[PDB]
Amino acid sequence: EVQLVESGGGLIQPGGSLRLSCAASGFTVSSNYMSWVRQAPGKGLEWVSVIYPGGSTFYADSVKGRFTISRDNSKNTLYLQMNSLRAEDTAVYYCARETLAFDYWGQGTLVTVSSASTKGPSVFPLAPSSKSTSGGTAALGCLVKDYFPEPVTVSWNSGALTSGVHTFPAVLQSSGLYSLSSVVTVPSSSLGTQTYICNVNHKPSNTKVDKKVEPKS
């Protein structure tokens, strides 16, 4: 029925600001209790703000002031204009339609680091090899490293292969940049035979690169 989608997340420094748009895909945001739910990664949730069908605010404890919610019924959009982020909110933001309980609440991210790198990948193909080969199957993958802007994605063959494709959690180095590697197993009879191209997309930047993985020379 109702499929709330949100947009507006990115990266900024303290004293910054940012408008978030809970785009009410779905109906009647004019007459519903709406709210913002926040969670830092590795942590439990937390509640931020709420609008009444009639207009009231009641902000949370720590984000009392410095933080503004509103709606637009004719556009079916909720608007969250924040500013002066203590950078201590670096969190994953959700907007949910409270219907006597909650439920129906999309997703959307944000990070408020005191820097900017915004660079993108460093992609290498990890070739299928006999040291990875065992009997009927052999594994190959793509290593995408050294990027700050956390949300990054790597698909296999434009989203074709869903068998054996496993992207591992990104790792945060001492350099301050993330890195990850996604690997997929495929029958050892099919080392080079078919197409295995990893599609790397970096959404905070605009990086899009396809890398083919082939057995070692």
Partner 1 sequence: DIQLTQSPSFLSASVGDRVTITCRASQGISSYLAWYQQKPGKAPKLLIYAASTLQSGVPSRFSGSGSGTEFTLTISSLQPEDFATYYCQQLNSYPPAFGGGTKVEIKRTVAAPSVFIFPPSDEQLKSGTASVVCLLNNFYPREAKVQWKVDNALQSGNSQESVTEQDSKDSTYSLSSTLTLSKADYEKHKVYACEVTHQGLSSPVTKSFNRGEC
Partner 2 sequence: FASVYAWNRKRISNCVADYSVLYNSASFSTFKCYGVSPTKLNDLCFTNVYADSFVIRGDEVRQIAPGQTGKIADYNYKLPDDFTGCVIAWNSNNLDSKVGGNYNYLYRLFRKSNLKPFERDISTEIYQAGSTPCNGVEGFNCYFPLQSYGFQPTNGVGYQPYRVVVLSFELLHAPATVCGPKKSTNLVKNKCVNFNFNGLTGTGVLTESNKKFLPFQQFGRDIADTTDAVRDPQTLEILDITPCSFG
d(CA 170, CA 180): 4
What torsion, rounded to 10 degrees, do the Cα atoms 188, 189, 193, 194 define? Answer: -70
Q: Count other C-beta atoms under 10 Å from residue 115's C-beta.
A: 9
Site for partner 2 in 71-110 (CB under 8 A): 99-100
Query: CB 37 → a second copy: shortest distance, Å?
Result: 23
Binding string to partner 1 for residues 114 to 143, with x set by CB under 8 A, is what?
--------x-xxxx-x-xxxx--xxx-x-x
Query: CB 135 → a second copy: shortest distance, Å?
Result: 38
d(CA 178, CA 169): 10
Site for partner 2 in 12-31 (CB under 8 A): 27-28, 31
- 8 A C-beta contact, residue 211 and residue 198: yes
d(CA 148, CA 125): 20
Indicate whether 62 belongs to the interface with partner 1 (CB under 8 A).
Answer: no
Indicate whether 206 belongs to the interface with a second copy (CB under 8 A).
Answer: yes
Name the one range near partner 2 by CB under 8 A: 54-62, 88-96, 111-119, 181-189: 54-62
DSSP, collapsed to helix, strand or coil, labels residue 17 as strand
Indicate whether 19 belongs to the interface with a second copy (CB under 8 A).
Answer: yes
Q: Which of 6, 21, 24, 32 binds partner 2 (CB under 8 A)?
A: 32
Question: Which phi and psi (to 5°) does residue 109 adopt?
Answer: -110, 175
Q: Which of 28, 166, 187, 192 binds partner 1 (CB under 8 A)?
A: 166
Total chain residues near partner 2 (CB under 8 A): 13
- 8 A C-beta contact, residue 112 and residue 46: no
- Among a second copy, partner 1, partner 2, none, the one that 166 touches (CB under a kind-dependent 5 to 8 A) is partner 1
